[PDB]
Each structure stands twice: as structure tokens, then as C-alpha cells.
Symmetry: C2
Subunit: 120 residues, 2 copies
């Protein structure tokens, strides 16, 4: 159903674990099939599991991700977290904001970051 604050902490942490390994099918299944994803925030949103799968495929395919502090969760199915992505030879500080639906799936994801958060 619509995830409690504590359940939101678990789901969002699970998302980060999945990104870290790069299990694309399992990542994609975390989203609603009509999920919208803004990454970075300000860019036009990509929509739906097909467009989202492609995003993660060229994102992660050829990469590491960890939380830098606790997940902050609300009581209306949303949450936000700080993490850092590492890659190739650099690093990127990120904050994701996620809203979950009544099935425990991600309906909306906005990622906040820009080049000032980037470090080679």
C-alpha cells in the first residue's frame, strides 16, 4: 500500500543498493509503469518503464552509489535522501526526492544536482 515513513526508509535505501550493483530489471521494477523521472531536476522528464530502463542502461551499464546520510521520510508516501555516485574517474553528490504510490512503487523521482556537485 502507501508506505509508512519507516517503509519509505527501507524502499529508498533498497533503491540505492540496487543502483550500486546495477541490477537494471530490479531497479526498473521499483517504479510504477507510468513513473516520471526528472534527472537532473530542471531537465524534461522521461516517462514510463521503457524510457526509464534505457536511462539506467546507459547510465550504469559501462559505477558506484552510497547514502551519505539517513533517508528523510514523510507520512504521505514521499522521502528524500543524500547520496554520492562514483564513476569514470570522478564523483557526484546527489539528493533524490521520491513519491511512492499505493503499491509501494515510485511514481515520481526528481534528482537534484549540477556541475558544482561534480568532482573529478
Amino acid at each position: 500500500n502507501l508506505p509508512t515513513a519507516q517503509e519509505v526508509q527501507g524502499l529508498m535505501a533498497r533503491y540505492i543498493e540496487l543502483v550500486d550493483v546495477g541490477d537494471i530489471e530490479a531497479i526498473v521494477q521499483m517504479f510504477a509503469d507510468d513513473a516520471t523521472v526528472e534527472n537532473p531536476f530542471g531537465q524534461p522528464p522521461i516517462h514510463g518503464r521503457e524510457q526509464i530502463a534505457a536511462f539506467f542502461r546507459q547510465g550504469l551499464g559501462g559505477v558506484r552509489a552510497c547514502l551519505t546520510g539517513p533517508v528523510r521520510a514523510s507520512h504521505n508516501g514521499c522521502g528524500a535522501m543524500p547520496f554520492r555516485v562514483e564513476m569514470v574517474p570522478c564523483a557526484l553528490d546527489v539528493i533524490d526526492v521520491m513519491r511512492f504510490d499505493e503499491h509501494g512503487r515510485i511514481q515520481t523521482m526528481q534528482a537534484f544536482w549540477s556541475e558544482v556537485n561534480l568532482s573529478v
Copy 2:
């Protein structure tokens, strides 16, 4: 005008400095006069500088606040940051998400946190 990513880092950091000391008039002046503030996210929004000033007055009046990681800024006048608030004898992990207007003032502020983020 509408603040660049770097300017957003400065503004949002300045907000945190102001909260730390508790300079209420200066905090309030950071907001647009018609700013909406959701704190915590999920609660109904308070609106306008009068309702916002009252919020900070009973919040900070009788308290310390610092960033726990870098501000994450976008290119469309928004940004997000992790910080921790301390008070009385406890501590609270928080993530604020802010949108700025074309005057460098805060038009919308949503704060993400709940009791799982609280620690006595």
C-alpha cells in the same frame, strides 16, 4: 534575478547560517512575501511572511542548525540540502527543498523529515 546554481548554493547556505543564530527578521526577508512553506512535508502549508515569521518565532525563539553535506543546486532556481537541527536535549536530521523566484527570494520551501529522523 533567477539565481544560478552557484548563487543557489550561496543563498541556501545563508539560510542555514541565519537559522543557526536565529535572526528572525533576516530569515523572513529571505522569503517572497507570498511564499508557501511546508514543514514537515505532508503537513498543510503555511503561507505569507506573517505566518512564516510566527513559525520561526516559536520554532527558534526559546537551538542550532548546520549543513551535513553540500547544497545540491539546479539550473531552474531550485536546490536541496541536508542539514541537522539541534535543540531542547535532542537532534533532528532534515532535508529542505527550495524554489527561488526571479528576485532571489524563496517562493516555496518543503522540509522532509519525520520522527524516524529524530533522536533524543
